[PDB]
Design a protein around this nucleic acid. Structure first.
Lengths: 97, 121, 128, 49, 145, 49, 228
RNA sequence: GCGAUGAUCUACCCAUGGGUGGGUACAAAUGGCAGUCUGACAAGU
RNA sequence: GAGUCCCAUAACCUUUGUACCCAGUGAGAAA
RNA sequence: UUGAGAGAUACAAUUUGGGAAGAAAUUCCCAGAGUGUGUUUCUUUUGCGUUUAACCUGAACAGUCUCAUCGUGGGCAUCUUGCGAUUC
């Protein structure tokens, strides 16, 4: 609940977060590290705001980037299920699977 | 009432999956739901091809909301796996996005299928 | 307007406002209690400075100097406090210096000289 | 190299639509006024109407 | 009665049924069974005849001008009951059926959530600077702690 | 206008290495040549696993 | 700094600075609802630009009698997410209540959340082909403007305007030929639509081609007589 | 019926009425700098 | 494949609402 | 080479109309339109000859082995002097 709140606070509205793709969610925190590196032809950050997620903290080294891609791409899928729902059971079963 | 706006019939899905077969033969088509959002924000999309039997169908319903602001076309095909094979990739694709290229040899096909899905909307 | 409301609306939101508004009430109750402690402890410590200028101004004077002795250590001209502003500001800036002098270098300073210095700034303000 | 060029391109694209926000484009359309009689049809002058 | 739940229940009943206040008004105004009344909708005209009225209920006839005379005297002839400018009570009504026809679960306010985090981060820095102030103040008495 | 002419120049610039970047990946490349001399690349119909 | 100039239509202004814009006096101070610029000159204002507001192209192209007036009630037919319903609230003031109708849920959430801020607008979320379904709300709105994109535009006006409009009232409608035919000339489409409105006791005053902002679009204004 | 327990010094105009000349704390900004990364292989035998 | 915290949870500029007026000298004053 | 229709209009014909000064005519700011000669783009009417076209596709670039991409070296300044593009 704390990492996901910082994504909503960064993006703004809930619907604008679902309209963001998987890469935008993954690099949602480090706009400073991304746009500096894009305009100088360097390497982009791989974590952003998602470093404080629990599953990213379980990985080590190179594995932290690999998890943060899969976690944010699943979070993009999870957020698109959330922001448009009419038959929501409020149990988060799609998030759990 | 339905899941979304228009679902292409048996006949329209021939020509709409003939172009994305020729586009992948040309390697111009961009594939995936998140990559279809990328070319929408860039504004270099031709039209977006979503699938009508996603599990769940919600996870690509964001694309019609990003559609009717820059008026890019969008259809539904009734199978992810059938869209996945016309894309030319072994995994199922729920959302395919043709990119624009004025110097392309699929030009007469790609503007044919543009205007008949304007009528579909 | 209480019988004729005209605004929006829940329950868990309404509980969170009153828990937050109780926190506002407990903060202002504590700040006023700390204020009442402030005007009594310093008036014990430095009574002549408290009598001459005030409770809130002398307390900011000590905090800006960093100690009570550095108000007395500095000259009467370099101290800055916050035709009348051209004369009575510098005249008072002397008076808070000797009030800080008589409140620092004794042990138990009496408030008689703060009242005496109050009469001196009273006669100067009438002269103005 | 592809990331930098699209970043400059999307900068110029966003400044274009921001540049279209405060700009004024004059309209010259087919502003046509219907009439009910032939006597008002041939006596029409826009300075009169 | 202009209750919040009741008027939303009355408005949906006035779109597809016969309301409780309409049935009460029909019984109190049932002077004779040979009375002709022109309803707003044709479906509400048939439902009024099907219910306990036993009168003549007219469909969407030329009485649309009578509906215009009703709405022109809607500020005027309302003073027989209560002279009111109906802008405010129609505003509360229209937002009520709009919030009810929409699903609108009240937890879907992300503007509440985003400044709750901004209140949560301000709580973290304010508790930190208050703990440091209590650190050195009692540390005057007890510096090892 | 300088926003637009810079943007469409950056679009043509981006497309010229984006075709070059997709030229390097995999697959059986084949260089077709137009009669006007405009080169392109058409690929084999192989489904990448 | 900016030279101000009121329009021929009352309640809407043109800010003639070094850059030029079409601008309206605010009713909600310090709040833009889709990211729009403003000029404070005192009274805070709000800008229009016709590329998303089909009424604004009718204003800027030159409209002879804008029946939307600074003291008159407006029926907004087809309230697309409040992108211009908030604008017609700024031009009619707090005097006449402006009515907005819509079907879809995505504009419906945006309308209700913005009509919370604006007491001029009351939103209706019911079908506009059934004026009896929201007959409990309106009596002779002073004018109606339509922006619907469903191919019965003439019927959806004639259904609503026959019993929700004041006699000798004004009716405005936005019609585009890509919605209705999309295969013939645009002028024959608008020629079909004005005889469609002529059969519904509406005398068509003016039709304007919205050429530099919305291709293949139109605005028809006219008077409506002798029913409802 | 002075003072070192500190004397004095540290903009245009309405025959004394406010902006302007302006410079600083902060309260904001749906104001800007400001544009949200690649896109099909990898791991075992 | 791939630069978080080195803070885009912020920095700086601009535009509004507010507050305020441009240390040091040392013996002169007043008539 | 026809039958008309729809215009940008190049020259002229008094006009039509708002404002100003023209005591008496003028004439200006202009806003257009109409008419003839132009000059014209496109729609159909029109007769003869011709039923084949155009594009895509299947296992359709490659032993004179081809194509990328980075480098290197030399030509073309009597000028493919070379674009994040391909000068040979």
């Amino acid at each position: 609940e704390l990492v996901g709140a910082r994504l909503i606070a960064h993006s703004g509205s809930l619907i604008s977060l679902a309209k963001s793709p998987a890469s935008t969610i993954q690099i949602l925190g480090a706009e400073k590290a991304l746009f500096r590196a894009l305009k100088t032809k360097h390497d982009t950050p791989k974590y952003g705001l998602l470093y404080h997620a629990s599953l990213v903290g379980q990985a080590t080294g190179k594995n932290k980037g690999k998890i943060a891609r899969v976690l944010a791409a699943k979070a993009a899928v999870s957020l698109r299920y959330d922001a448009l729902a009419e038959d929501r059971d409020d149990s988060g079963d799609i998030g759990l699977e | 009432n339905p899941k979304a706006f228009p679902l292409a019939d048996a006949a329209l899905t021939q020509q709409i999956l003939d172009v994305v077969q020729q586009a992948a033969n040309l390697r111009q088509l961009k594939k995936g739901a998140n990559e279809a959002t990328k070319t929408l924000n860039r504004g270099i999309s031709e039209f977006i091809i979503m699938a009508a039997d996603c599990e769940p169908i919600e996870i690509l319903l964001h694309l019609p909301l990003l559609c009717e602001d820059k008026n890019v076309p969008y259809v539904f095909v009734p199978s992810r796996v059938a869209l996945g094979r016309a894309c030319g990739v072994s995994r199922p694709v729920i959302a395919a996005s043709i990119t624009t290229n004025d110097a392309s040899a699929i030009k007469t096909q790609i503007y044919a299928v543009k205007d008949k899905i304007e009528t579909l909307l | 307007x209480x019988x004729x409301x005209x605004x929006x609306x829940s329950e868990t939101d309404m509980e969170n406002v009153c828990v937050f508004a109780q926190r506002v009430a407990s903060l202002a109750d504590y700040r006023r209690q700390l204020y009442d402690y402030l005007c009594e402890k310093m008036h014990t410590v430095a009574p002549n400075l408290s009598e001459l200028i005030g409770e809130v101004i002398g307390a900011r004077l000590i905090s800006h100097a960093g100690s009570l002795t550095n108000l007395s250590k500095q000259a009467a001209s370099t101290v800055q406090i916050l035709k009348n502003k051209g004369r009575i500001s510098r005249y008072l800036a002397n008076k808070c210096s000797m009030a800080s002098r008589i409140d620092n270098y004794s042990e138990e300073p009496s408030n008689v000289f703060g009242s005496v210095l109050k009469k001196q700034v009273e006669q100067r303000l009438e002269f103005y | 190299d592809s990331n930098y060029v699209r970043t400059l391109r999307q900068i110029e694209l966003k400044k274009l639509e921001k540049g279209a926000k405060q700009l004024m484009f004059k309209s010259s359309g087919n502003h046509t006024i219907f009439v009910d009689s032939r006597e008002k049809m041939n006596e029409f002058t826009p300075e009169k109407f | 009665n202009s209750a919040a739940n009741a008027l939303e229940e009355a408005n949906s009943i006035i779109e597809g049924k016969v309301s409780s206040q309409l049935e009460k008004l029909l019984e109190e105004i049932k002077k004779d069974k040979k009375s002709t009344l022109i309803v707003s909708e044709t479906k509400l005209a048939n439902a009024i005849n099907k219910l306990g009225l036993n009168f003549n209920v007219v469909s969407d006839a030329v009485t649309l001008d009578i509906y215009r005379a009703i709405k022109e005297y809607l500020p005027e002839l309302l003073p027989g009951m209560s002279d009111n400018d109906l802008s405010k009570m129609s505003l509360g009504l229209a937002h009520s059926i709009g919030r009810h026809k929409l699903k609108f679960s009240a937890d879907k306010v992300d503007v509440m959530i985003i400044q709750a985090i901004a209140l949560l981060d301000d709580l973290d820095k304010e508790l930190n600077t208050y703990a440091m102030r209590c650190k050195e103040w009692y540390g005057w008495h007890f510096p090892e702690l | 206008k300088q926003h637009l002419q810079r943007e469409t120049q950056l679009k043509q610039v981006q497309q010229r290495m984006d075709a070059q970047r997709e030229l390097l990946k995999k697959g059986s490349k084949k260089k077709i040549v137009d009669s006007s001399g405009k080169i392109s690349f058409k690929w084999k119909k192989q489904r990448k696993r | 700094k900016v030279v101000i100039e009121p329009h021929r239509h009352a309640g809407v202004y043109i800010a003639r600075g070094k850059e030029d814009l079409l601008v309206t006096k605010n009713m909600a101070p310090g709040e833009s609802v889709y990211g729009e610029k403003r000029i404070s000159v005192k009274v805070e204002y709000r800008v229009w630009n016709p590329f998303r507001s089909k009424l604004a192209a009718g204003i800027m192209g030159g409209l002879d009698e804008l029946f939307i007036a600074p003291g008159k009630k407006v029926l907004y037919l087809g309230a697309a997410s409040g992108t211009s319903v908030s604008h017609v609230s700024d031009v009619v003031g707090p005097e006449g209540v402006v009515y907005a109708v819509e079907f879809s849920h995505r504009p419906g959430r945006e309308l209700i959340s913005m009509a919370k801020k604006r007491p001029n607008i009351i939103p209706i979320i019911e079908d506009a082909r059934h004026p009896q379904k929201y007959r409990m709300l309106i009596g002779m709105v002073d004018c109606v403007f339509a922006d619907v994109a469903q191919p019965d535009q003439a019927r959806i006006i004639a259904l609503n305007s026959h019993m929700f409009l004041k006699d000798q009232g004004g009716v405005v409608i936005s019609i585009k030929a890509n919605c209705i035919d999309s295969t013939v000339d645009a002028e024959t489409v608008f020629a079909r639509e004005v005889q469609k409105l002529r059969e519904e006791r509406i005398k068509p005053l003016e039709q304007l081609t919205l050429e530099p902002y919305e291709r293949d679009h139109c605005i028809v204004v006219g008077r409506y007589m002798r029913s409802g």
